[PDB]
Each structure stands twice: as structure tokens, then as C-alpha cells.
Structure 1
């Protein structure tokens, strides 16, 4: 299925706090559509965290 992989990519790789969920962030869901593609890089979690961070930044600009 898909639930276990998404739970991994949310609570082990990205390590979001529980108060942040799919319904709170549309960009996070549209990005998890991509993040589940690669099964590697699940040790350098800092890279995924920074990627989500800059994705939020680029999503929130007024330009």
C-alpha cells in the first residue's frame, strides 16, 4: 500500500511534529507526491528538511 511509506517519509525522514499534517500544508502533500519516489537518501534527512523549507519559501513569495 501507500500508508506505511508516507508515514516513514513524514515521521522518520522529515520528522515533522504531529501537529503538522497533510490538511495543514498543500505544498507538503504535493511534495510528498515526489519524495516517496526515491527510496535512497533516507540517512541525510537534513537535506529533505532543507528542501521542504526552501519549497515553502518559494511557495510563499508574492512574485
Structure 2
């Protein structure tokens, strides 16, 4: 069911390496819902990539 959609996001859009997985890094699994509910701008690639990129920058911080 949803596994084909999350695979469509992780691969066709995010272009994540196979070693990365939704069961590996938690922030992607938390973001699978927000990535799924949206439908616009799938033709863009840098958007979701920069989103997960900056969100990983929020994932670890001392201040």
C-alpha cells in the first residue's frame, strides 16, 4: 500500500542511497507523512532534498 509511495519518495525524489532507509534514520520516518500528503512540485528535486538536509542540521545541535 503506502510502501510503494514511500519508495517513490525515497528513490524517485530524494535519490537516497540504498544504505539509507526509513528504518535507519528516524527523521525521514517522521517526515514520511508530510512528504506523502503533499502532491505538488514533484517535478522539483532540490526542494525535498534541501528540506531533509536542513532538517538534519536541526537534528543535532548544542545551542
- Structure 2 length-normalised TM: 0.90
Aligned to 2:26: 26
Give structure 1 regions of 4+ aligned residues with deviation exceeding 6 angstroms.
none
- Mapped partners of 1:40, 1:13: distance in 2: 12
- Structure 1 length-normalised TM: 0.90
Gaps of 5+ in 1: none
- Mapped partners of 1:12, 1:21: distance in 2: 14
Count of residues in Structure 1 that have an aligned counterpart in Structure 2: 63
- Mapped partners of 2:3, 2:34: distance in 1: 15
